[PDB]
Each structure stands twice: as C-alpha cells, then as structure tokens.
Design a protein around this ligand. Sequence first.
Ligand SMILES: Cc1cc2nc3c(=O)[nH]c(=O)nc-3n(C[C@H](O)[C@H](O)[C@H](O)COP(=O)(O)OP(=O)(O)OC[C@@H]3O[C@@H](n4cnc5c(N)ncnc54)[C@H](O)[C@@H]3O)c2cc1C
Ligand SMILES: Nc1nc2c(c(=O)[nH]1)N[C@@H](CNc1ccc(C(=O)N[C@@H](CCC(=O)O)C(=O)O)cc1)CN2
Ligand SMILES: Nc1nc2c(c(=O)[nH]1)N[C@@H](CNc1ccc(C(=O)N[C@@H](CCC(=O)O)C(=O)O)cc1)CN2
Ligand SMILES: [Mg+2]
Lengths: 310, 827, 103
Amino acid sequence: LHPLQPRLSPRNLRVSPFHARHKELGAFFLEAGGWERPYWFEANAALLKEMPAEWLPPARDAWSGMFSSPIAAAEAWKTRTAVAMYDMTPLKRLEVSGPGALKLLQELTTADLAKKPGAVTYTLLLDHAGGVRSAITVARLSEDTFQLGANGNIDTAYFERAARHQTQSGSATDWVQVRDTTGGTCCIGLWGPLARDLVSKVSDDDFTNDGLKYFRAKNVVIGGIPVTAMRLSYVGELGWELYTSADNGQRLWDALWQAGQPFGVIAAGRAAFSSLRLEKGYRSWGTDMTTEHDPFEAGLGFAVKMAKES
Amino acid sequence: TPRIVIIGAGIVGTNLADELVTRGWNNITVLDQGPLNMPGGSTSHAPGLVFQTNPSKTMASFAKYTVEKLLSLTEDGVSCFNQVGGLEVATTETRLADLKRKLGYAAAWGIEGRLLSPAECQELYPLLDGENILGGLHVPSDGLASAARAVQLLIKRTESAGVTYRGSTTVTGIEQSGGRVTGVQTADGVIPADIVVSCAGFWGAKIGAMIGMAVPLLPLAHQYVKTTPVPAQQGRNDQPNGARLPILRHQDQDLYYREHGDRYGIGSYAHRPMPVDVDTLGAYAPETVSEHHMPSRLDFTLEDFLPAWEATKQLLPALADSEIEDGFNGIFSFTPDGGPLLGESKELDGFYVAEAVWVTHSAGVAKAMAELLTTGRSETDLGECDITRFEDVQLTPEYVSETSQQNFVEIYDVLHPLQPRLSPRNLRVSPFHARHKELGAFFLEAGGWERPYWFEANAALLKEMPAEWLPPARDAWSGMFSSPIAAAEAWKTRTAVAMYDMTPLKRLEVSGPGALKLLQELTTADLAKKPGAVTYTLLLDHAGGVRSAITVARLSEDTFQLGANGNIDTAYFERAARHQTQSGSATDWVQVRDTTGGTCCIGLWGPLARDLVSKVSDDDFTNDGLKYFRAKNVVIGGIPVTAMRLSYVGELGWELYTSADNGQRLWDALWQAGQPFGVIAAGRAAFSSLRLEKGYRSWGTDMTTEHDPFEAGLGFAVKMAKESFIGKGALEGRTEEASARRLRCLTIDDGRSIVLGKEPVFYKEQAVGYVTSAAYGYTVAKPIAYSYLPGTVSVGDSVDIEYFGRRITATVTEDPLYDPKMTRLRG
Amino acid sequence: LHPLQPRLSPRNLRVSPFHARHKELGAFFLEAGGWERPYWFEANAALLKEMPAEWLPPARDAWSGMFSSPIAAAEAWKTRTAVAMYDMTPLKRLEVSGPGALK
Ligand SMILES: Cc1cc2nc3c(=O)[nH]c(=O)nc-3n(C[C@H](O)[C@H](O)[C@H](O)COP(=O)(O)OP(=O)(O)OC[C@@H]3O[C@@H](n4cnc5c(N)ncnc54)[C@H](O)[C@@H]3O)c2cc1C
Ligand SMILES: Nc1nc2c(c(=O)[nH]1)N[C@@H](CNc1ccc(C(=O)N[C@@H](CCC(=O)O)C(=O)O)cc1)CN2
Ligand SMILES: Nc1nc2c(c(=O)[nH]1)N[C@@H](CNc1ccc(C(=O)N[C@@H](CCC(=O)O)C(=O)O)cc1)CN2
Ligand SMILES: [Mg+2]
C-alpha cells in the first residue's frame, strides 16, 4: 500500500462548510481524522496551459505519482504569485477559557503568553525530559480566552486532563475549561501576494501592516461575516487565517471567491500546501519532531523562552 | 435611588427623566452637547405627525400613551398636542385593501377609526383632488405633537423636581469598573453614575462605540419642505403654525403633509436613501444653534425633491399656486427592522439604550424604560424593541447600513408579513443546505438563517395525495409565500416520515458546577434529576409574566442544553450566569455558550420514524430504549448524535443533534434509510400548521411578558411546589380557571377563510381579542387561529375575526385539535 | 387562475443543456411546450442594491405581481447597459434541406 492510500469507505464523515463549493471545483479528496481534505482541484487543470515552464515539474515515477498530480504545481504557482484559498478547517482548534486559562498555558507551553490580547504565538509543549510533545499556536483572543491551533486529539486529551487537574486543586480563580471547537467552526487560509488586494474589496477593516501586524489577531467583518483574522501563513506568503462559525463559512467563502476573480484567485489543496511549507522549513509535529527530540535538535530553539520562570 | 445620567435632552431623554421622577427617582442628571433651549437633535426639527395605528401592539400602545401624555402637558392653557385627527388616503386598489387591514389593527389595539369613501374624503379634506382618491382611513385621535415645546415643559417640571440639566456639555467617553458603569466622561471631568441611559438619537452608534457596544441604527437624512403661503389657505388657520385639517398621509407616493398656518409642510421619503456620517457633522458651538443651523439639519437637495413636488401638486392642486419656500435634509435614525432599540447593554451592567424612537412613540418608550429601571420590568412587551433581539451577523455595520436603507426605501410600502429581503441573504446556512437546494427548497430568512418553507421536490407528491388533504384555493394575500406543497408535507409527516431542519433553533449550552443552581432559580421546573431528562419550562419575570418558554435537557451532571427562543434569551442567561459567577464560590461558576452556529439538528418525525432510524443505528429507539422527553447519545450512520424524544409537530420521533461537520453525513444516512418509507424533507409552512394542530404555544406571539402562564394555558409547566424561582411569589393563588383572559383555539367555520395574525376578534360585536398565531390546519381541514379571550367566553362559543374588513365566523374549540390522547407521541 | 400559473406536475420534461448552470444561478422556471424556461434568476437579486433608482419599477398589485419579480428590472438594466445571456434553446428550430428547399 502507498502511504497516501485512502479507504473507500467509510468516507464523508466530516466535511467543512465549503464542501459543496469544493466539489464544484472538482476537489480530489483524501481523508484524515474523519475529515475530507482536498489535495488539489481539477478546476485548476485549466491553468497548466498558462503556467510558465519553469514551474512544471519533471515526470514522476509510478509510486511517487500515486495520489499526486501536476495540478499541485499550478496551485503552488498561484499561491506564490497571485492569491489562493486553502481550507484550514480540519486544523485542530481548541478554546481554553476561564480565569485560570493563562495560568494553565503559562505552565504547559514554552512561551510567555502574558501579553495584551491579540498576540499569536508559535510555541511548544514539552514533557519533563524536554522532548517535544507538540508544536502549536496560541492566540489570546481576550483576557480569559485563548484559541489554540493544535496537532490532534492527543493534544486535546492532554489539555483536558491538565485543565481538570488545575480546576480541581485550585481556587475560584483557577478554573479553566477546554473545548474542541474544530467541528463547529471553519477557517480559510487566504495567502499570496495579492491577498490584500482581494480582501480589501470585501471588508472595511484595515488589513495593511499598520492595521494588523504579523502574528497578531483581531476581529473583522468580511462579506458581512464576523471573522477572527490571524496574520500568519504556513505557506510563507502574505495573508491571514480567517476563522468563523460553521454556519457563516459558505458565505465567507463565496464573498472571497467573488472578490478574487479579477486577481485570479484559486482554491488550493494539501499537495501544494505541504510542498510550500517545506520550502519554508516549517516543522510538522509527529514526523519532523516527536518526544524523542528536544527543541534544539529540531531547530526550534527560537520558540523556547528559557528566561521564563517556569 | 441610584444616580442616573441621561445622555440626550431630546423628546426621549426628557420624557424618561419625567417618567422616572413621577416614580420617585429624581437623582438624575441630563446632559446635552447642545443648548437647553434648543438642543439641536432630530427633536428640534420634527414636524410632529402622530399616527397611532400600527401593526405592532406595543408600538400602538406607545403611540396612544404619547398622545395622552402630550395632551396633558400644558402651559398658559396650550397643550403639546393638537388633535386634528389623521387621514391616510389610497390612490391604488392595493392601498385601499391595506387600509382595511389597518382598520383591523386599530380595532385590535383599541384605536377608534373609520374607512371613508372618496366623497367622505372630499368632505373631510376638500383640498384633495378626488379623481385619484379611492378611499381613506380616518382616525380622529391622531394629530400633531409640539415636540420641541414638550421638551421645554418637561425640562421645566423635572427641574422643579430636582433633576439637573447640563446643556453645552459633550460626552466623550464612558467610565467603568468591574463590568459596570461608574460614570460619564466630559472635557470638564467625570460625572458619576450608577445607571447611564443613552438617549442620544442618531448619535447612538457613536455613543455605543464608547463601551464597545454595537448599536444597530443608521443615521439617514429625510426631506422636509415648507411652501410659501398657499392662496387657498388664506385666513383659515392661526399664524404662524396653526393647523385644523387632519394630518395627511399619501403613502402611495411616499409623502405626508401638515399645515403650518397658511403654508404646507411636506415630508418626503420619495428620495434615495441618504446615509449620514455623524463624525463629519462638526461640533456646533451652543450659541450658534438656531432653527436653521443645528446638527440635525443638512443642506436641502432640491433635485431630490422635484418628483415629490410634482406628486404633491397632483394630490393637492391648490399647492400648485405656491412655491417651495424652505427645505432641509433632516437627519434621524433607521434600524434593520424598523423597531426601536431599548434595554440594558450586553457589554456593561447599568448602561441602557433608548434609541431610534419616533416622536410618535417617545413617551411610551420613556414609560417602558422607567418601569424597567425602577422595577426591573416593563409593563409592555419589549420583545421587538429589545436591543438584544439581534443575532451577531445582524449587528455588523454593513448589515445595519444595507437593511436600514432598505427599511427607508420601503417605509410606506404595503408588505406581506412573510415578505423576505432579497439582500443580504445566505448569511447563515445549515449543513444540509446543498441537499435542500437539490430538493428545490423555497427559503425565507430569520435571524440570518436560510429556512426552507417547503420543497419543490415534494410537488410530485400532490398527484398521489388523497383529496381529503387538499386545501381549498387561497386568496392572493394569504397565498403569498404559501404553497399547496405544504399540504403534502403535512400529509407525509402525519402518515409516513419527514425530516425537518431544526438547526436554526437557538441552542445554548449552560455548563459548570453552578449550572443546575442557575437554572433552578431562572426556570419554573425542578431540574435536579439524573441526566437524560428533557423538560419544557418557562422563564418568568418577577411579576410572573412569561419571558420565554424553553426546553432544558440535562446532558450530564454539570451540562445542560437549552432550546431557547432567540438572542434575548442568550443575553438573559449570559448576564445571569456572570452575576452568579462573580458573587459565588468556586462551585458556583457557570458558563453559557450559544452553540447554534456550530451544531445542527434534524427533527425526524412521523409514524414510520422508528422503522427508518433502526436501519441506520444499532441503538435502542423503542419506548424501552428511550422514553418520551428523554435524551441519550446514539450513533446514526456512523455519526455521534444526541437524540431527544419530543416533537413540536406532534408525532413519533426525535430531535437529532450533532456537530456541523457531521451534519451532511447524518442527513444522507437518514435520507437513504428512508427511501423505502417514502421519507421527505419538510419545511416551515407544514411545521407551523402541525404545531398549531397540537396547541403548542410560540413565545412572542402566543404569550409575552404581558401574560402569566395560567392565562396562556401553560400552568402545567409551572412547578408551584418549587422552593424558589423568579416569579413564584407573583403567581401564588393563580389558576387557569380563574384567569380573566385565556388563550383560546379558534377554528374558522367556513373551512376556507384563512387569517394571518393581528386580526381583531369580536364577541357579541365587541373587540375582545386578536389573532396571535394562525395557519391552515391540514389534518383538521380548516383554518386555525389563536386569540386571548375574556375568561367568560367558553369552548363552543362563536366569535368573529375581521380580515380585510370582513367578519369571519369562528368557534372556540378545545385543544389540541389533533390527537388529544397523545397516542401518536407517548409509549 | 393567473395567466402565468404553471402546473406543478408534470415538470422538467424538456430542459436545455444549460439547466444545471441555471439552477446554480437560482433560476425561477415556468414551462411552455414541455420546456423549462427561466423567467429570472435569483442570483441577480444581488444586483438590485447597485441598480440606479431610475431602473426600479413601482410596486405591483397582487395580481400583476404574481409570477413576476423586481429582479426582472435588474436583468433588463444589465441587458441594456452591459451584457446578458438568454436561453433561446426553446425557440422552435426547423431544418429544411434538399434540392427543393429554396423552391
Ligand atoms: C425631517 C424629519 C421629519 C420627522 N417627522 C416625524 C413625524 O412627523 N412624526 C414622528 O413621530 N417623528 C418624526 N421624526 C422623527 C423624530 O424627530 C425622531 O425620531 C425623534 O425626535 C428622536 O428623538 P430623540 O430624543 O431620540 O433624539 P434627539 O432629538 O436627536 O436628541 C438626542 C440628542 O442627544 C444629544 N447628544 C448626542 N450625542 C451627545 C454627546 N456625545 N454628549 C452630549 N449630548 C449628546 C444631542 O445633542 C441631541 O439633543 C422626523 C425626523 C426628521 C429628521
Ligand atoms: N493557527 C495555526 N496553528 C497551527 C498551524 C497552522 O498552520 N496555523 N500548524 C501547526 C503548527 N505549525 C507552525 C509552524 C511554523 C509557523 C510559522 O509561522 N513560523 C515562522 C514564524 C514563527 C514565530 O516568529 O514564532 C518562523 O519563520 O518559523 C506557524 C505554525 C499546528 N498549529
Ligand atoms: N428541543 C426544543 N426546544 C424548544 C422547541 C422545540 O421544538 N424543540 N421550541 C420552542 C419551545 N416550545 C415547545 C412547546 C411544546 C413542546 C411539547 O412537546 N409539549 C407537550 C409535552 C410537554 C411536557 O409534558 O412538559 C405538551 O403536550 O404541551 C416542546 C417545545 C423553543 N424551545
Ligand atoms: Mg419608499
């Protein structure tokens, strides 16, 4: 069996709010964690006739060509030179809330999270030996509410137990609740050099550098939909992760899609996504590092604030 | 009494100070950036036309009270109301029909009115060219408010009672601590306050931003023009502002009129919407404010007015011998639904709004708010006025701008109660939305959600449907936004199995060690039962009035899911949970989440519901496996689901809840299992009809805070034996049988004449009630309507319902109309 | 019955090749000769907020308003000022061929 080989059943268990639009665009779906994830979009085949030859990869052998397509090259191309919409809905999304939330995260992570709300921080979770249990993002949305981009249900269970333990043994001001909100929310990664040109057509919020700096978050309205925008890009380009409730997702998608037409916006899938993030050197927990590695071996020293008290 | 600061000395803020004073609260400071003698908000330019009749019972009562209050507000023998009566004329058949519906509202709300023939219209208002007049509606108690004079007299008498007024004082921020208001910032310092009420008119959104509150009003300009002296009017009225003819509405041309001595005042909505940026108005130095120079008056744009002037000369040819003398583009407030914005902010304890209020409703709004502040409740239902009625997508600046401008464009149009907007649409959709479009769903929206009213795919079933299920033809009005397809969907729900989309039902998760304690105090049920129980229960106010009717499902020791009625509930629970948390122990904390947008629900109902679900689940759905009004977790088509056994349509089956990401799978699994059982998707038209056949009440129409549970026939849901709950003391002694007014089920005798809501109900030729809910009952094959009626009227008695001026005979009937032994439901 | 009143069944007997695209655009279909014919497209509702007021018609009475929509005004507007695609597939189309055709 090839490492990407999907099951044929059961399928379509979990789908993002954009699923109808993705099928319209001829998404090739693979599954992970029950979620259907586009790996590329057949609609983008039409772009290969226009793509510069410098972007066209050589033939693949039969094995590396399984569950791959030249279309991924066109999607990488447009992400690097135009603007792309990636479905980040399946990214594990945890809400950690309550008066003991900051205290919990200060102890579990390698970052100083005690900053006025709006900061996004890439940070690690270690075990007592210094091995890397996880690498996550923490966005402080308000005094007592943080949204985490985690790595899966191992993280979820880790936070659940730790929050329960803190709550049980703490005061009236140490209680903290952890919710897995992934299934109730969605996210579009809107990335590429024309990302500002696009979003400014559908929002009156300020998306310039002055309005939202790198690794910051704020609430905005796009196409009429309340969104939490976070400025970062696992693909290494300008733009934002745009989060909203599942019921609003399709509208947000359609609004952006329409705004993006003059900029040549495309839907982009996981094959391009993985290639682009590797060009950026961004680590993926579970393969690039595990608890067998410390942050310095993995080249993640920068994410560890050794000056923290604890 | 608490220290109050009121922001704004318009007709709203001064009436509020007054209503508070008469209730013994006089520790009040009123602030206005303008001079006290002419503050310069919309109140300082309003022509003051007061038409009481309104489709809304609450707005109508506010208007009646304003008329009574202004008539009694007097000095040197001259009151602040000139009661010349009001006349709405019709120049199209469509409008003529609508005046008959409005005459119904008037009877329903206790306002005396008459329909006039064209000849009678000419006798009452001789300046009308009769050639295009088809009829008029005359209300003798309407008239003209002297709004700016009323402000002065109100300032005078409240000042005498100890109220402090500070004009030329600009509020620049709001001070707070611990989630509660502490004061009001001005350049010269902070004015301390325990309560702040923003009565700032079209500045309201600007005041709101000061505490991070979204106030969904849009400032819009509206043209008002005065003519030169009109020759026909020479000598008829007192100069300079006398009036003797009824105020005049010409809604077909978006115009209204009044006299100003021998001149005419012309109000036009017959121009493009004109949004105003309040930040560009400029700061007016108080000493510069005068009649033609104030912040609320923008330059007149003659070009916009020319068509209105032509139409005016057609209606009233005498004015063709006058000219336009002075015009201005006058600013005031519009909202997404035309309702005002009243009540306590979500963001800040002790901070209240009373904004976007017509002079017509001002005193009534002030009275309601003064009741709210001093007693904790308004004596009038504020369900359509509460600031918290709006969903999140409805509070964005873009939605507020777009829908308020559309409200302005449609302000005087004849509109069906179901008429949807064409934009913005598709804001919120359930996970089943693609499947619904495949099935040709006809969508209407509410709260931002797209809701199927029926499915064109089901048209194919009408050829097979027994004739007993086919309703008679509908008239054009009751047929709008209706379809015979709803009959087939009711049919299949009653005889087969249907899948309804219950996703839009407000869904609240109340969790934490103090959750049970919170709900025990707020609701009328004993919720302390092992998890798995579902309970239908009420939320009362301290007077025993019904704030809401909800379901509470106890999912675990510290987690409850509530099926609530909208965002008024959400904000009510949010504040109550916060208050309990702040003042309680480590074991009293409780969190409230609105999870509606992250979850979905299918109502799987009908006699074949078990046959269907048992094909896609190994869980036990027999009576032994899940009893009526119980919940448990199951797996269906591979999806984890919370199943609750109950049915607002009165049939066997369950509400099936799951996370949004799983919804489409659950739907498809059920859809496929249901094929041999003839499963259909069923929409809201069938849903509403079926639930009325069951006698189930709908909060907001069938009962509001104006009713107690016994009047509404909801006594069964109140556990009077509870040790404690909000409203309990007020209900002591009350029973359904002794209630002076009781909610009754009517069926329409002719089997055919459908009514829609708000129609007056008559007993022995007296108006004694009005239609709350109504639908055609497909199972009983006749129209149904509910109305409060004097306790004196009994089952079997006859009543008349007036519909477009025609009396329709109906009979008071025992409910439920369908399956009163509940044999379809229980066991 | 209104002169435009359609049957609810049988329907969808004859459809043009554009039918899927028309449903995507929220076509309101009426039938004639067995063909499903869009009378207007709900997708075009979005254009009314942008349309000049000069193009907006007055309210219709209930009868003339049946099987009509303000959306038709926006579609007329765009046809007169931009570019529109109408489905003329149902127009009866006859091929007359052979050496005696001209005769
Ligand atoms: C052209 C026109 C015609 C109209 N015709 C009618 C009609 O015929 N019938 C009818 O019922 N209604 C009519 N209206 C509507 C009407 O006038 C308003 O609905 C009403 O006057 C609102 O009263 P208010 O007390 O809420 O607001 P306002 O009268 O606007 O007073 C509120 C204010 O608060 C003050 N304020 C605002 N911000 C601050 C601050 N930061 N610090 C201190 N003070 C502040 C302002 O200076 C002002 O006095 C008309 C309005 C216009 C523009
Ligand atoms: N919400 C969000 N959370 C997440 C991911 C995501 O895709 N988006 N993906 C996973 C973790 N990964 C990364 C790895 C690198 C970066 C990144 O952006 N690194 C920049 C900036 C780092 C910073 O200065 O600390 C640097 O050049 O390495 C962001 C998420 C899971 N958590
Ligand atoms: N989840 C759920 N919650 C809800 C509604 C719903 O549709 N489902 N709809 C709203 C409230 N309404 C009702 C009204 C009646 C019933 C009902 O079922 N009444 C039966 C049983 C009552 C019981 O014995 O107390 C009786 O015959 O009156 C259920 C919800 C909002 N809350
Ligand atoms: Mg209008």
